[PDB]
């Protein structure tokens, strides 16, 4: 919880059973630093059915953004004020079943310049 950018979380069983449909579930395995219980996908799981309910109840909805079938599966965290209103919060990208948080174009550069100098 010190720095979310500097944490990586994984799990071998889910690795072979990974598909475009299951990426959200892998992020949802719980005990995963990046995702949170507060997210509504979790509330949907606690209730029943996942359909256009993310457009009805609008809020924290982790949604897959771009997907390459074998490994690459990018997830985006949105905060909706209303239907047809989306606010992007952050992006977590999964490479080879390893989840990282997408570095800001500027936090990365600041750290980089600091180490070199």
């Amino acid at each position: 919880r010190d720095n979310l950018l500097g944490i990586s979380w994984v799990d071998s069983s889910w690795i072979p059973i990974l598909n475009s449909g299951s990426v959200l579930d892998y992020f949802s395995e719980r005990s995963n630093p990046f995702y949170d219980r507060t997210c509504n996908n979790e509330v949907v799981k606690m209730q029943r059915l996942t359909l256009e309910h993310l457009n009805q109840m609008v809020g924290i909805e982790y949604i897959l953004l771009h997907a390459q079938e074998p490994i690459l599966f990018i997830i985006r965290k949105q905060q909706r004020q209303s239907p047809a209103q989306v606010i992007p919060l952050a992006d977590y990208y999964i490479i080879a079943g390893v989840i990282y948080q997408a570095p800001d174009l500027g936090s990365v550069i600041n750290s980089r310049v600091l180490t070199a100098v």
Binding site: I7, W9, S31, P33
Partner: protein, 69 residues
């Protein structure tokens, strides 16, 4: 919660360097139960466990492998 890839032993190690003198000796050959990895892997066992343990046996003790196969 969030455990890391496993760390090196920290419990021991400090004793093994010691002052290069009075070191801990090799641990004795525990001829019983151990816990490598996650499996118990206890000692004193056979190579091919009899099929009688876990399943029915449809073959008599004559067992002329070539004929029964």
């Amino acid at each position: 919660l969030l455990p890391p890839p496993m760390q090196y032993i920290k419990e021991y190690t400090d004793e093994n360097i010691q002052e290069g003198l009075a070191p801990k000796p090799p641990p004795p050959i525990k001829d019983s139960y151990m816990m490598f990895g996650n499996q118990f892997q206890c000692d004193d066992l056979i190579i091919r466990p009899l099929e009688s343990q876990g399943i029915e046996r449809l073959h008599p003790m004559q067992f002329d492998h070539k004929k029964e196969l």
